Write a protein that binds this ligand. Structure first.
Ligand SMILES: O[C@H]1CC[C@@](O)(CNc2ncnc3[nH]ccc23)CC1
Ligand SMILES: [Cl-]
Length: 167
């Protein structure tokens, strides 16, 4: 039993809700919140910009030190950093950005990072400003993640389409 509330159950391990991931994280304080990161951990917009804003830019400050030490992530890769005031940890995961021409096949690799954590609050990877089809992202999530994932979908119209089209 966990404290996630109001989710629709899609499969044994995948759950979905129309919610602002920032507000969900503040309420639940999950062990892991997933960020829709880029390889430079520049949290300018989308989910990343919103999460970082909610940390009063502390996420960005920590991220800049991480990059200065380690260099950029790989597309499809991840790193674990602090969750600041939102969660114990933030798993920064880089899905492919279609608006940069990146290979959508890397979306499966990106979701594999979730399997290193027993329970996560997450957005749909490569959705929104990353330009992928969110219906496809949900399919890859369900077919790749085996740990317990609670998906927050900001857009109510999109949430309803994801549910009604889910096979
Ligand atoms: O087009 C849709 C695709 C999924 C998404 O859910 C991605 N972006 C977010 N997902 C959850 N919480 C959030 N807060 C700010 C941004 C944000 C919405 C756009
Ligand atoms: Cl977005």
């Amino acid at each position: 039993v966990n404290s996630f509330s109001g989710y629709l159950k899609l499969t044994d391990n995948v759950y979905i809700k129309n919610a602002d991931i920032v507000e969900e994280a503040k309420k639940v304080k999950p062990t892991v919140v997933v960020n829709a990161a880029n390889v430079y951990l520049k949290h300018g917009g989308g989910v990343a910009g919103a999460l970082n804003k909610a940390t009063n830019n502390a996420m960005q400050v920590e991220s800049d030190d991480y990059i200065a030490t380690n260099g950029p992530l790989k597309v499809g890769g991840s790193c674990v950093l602090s969750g600041h005031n939102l969660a114990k940890h933030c798993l920064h995961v880089v899905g492919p950005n279609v608006n940069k021409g990146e290979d959508i096949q890397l979306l499966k690799s990106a979701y594999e990072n979730f399997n290193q954590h027993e329970v996560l609050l997450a957005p749909l990877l490569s959705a929104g400003i990353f330009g992928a089809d969110p219906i496809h992202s949900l399919r890859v999530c369900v077919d790749t993640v085996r740990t317990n994932v609670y998906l927050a979908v900001f857009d109510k119209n999109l949430y309803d389409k994801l549910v009604s089209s889910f096979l």
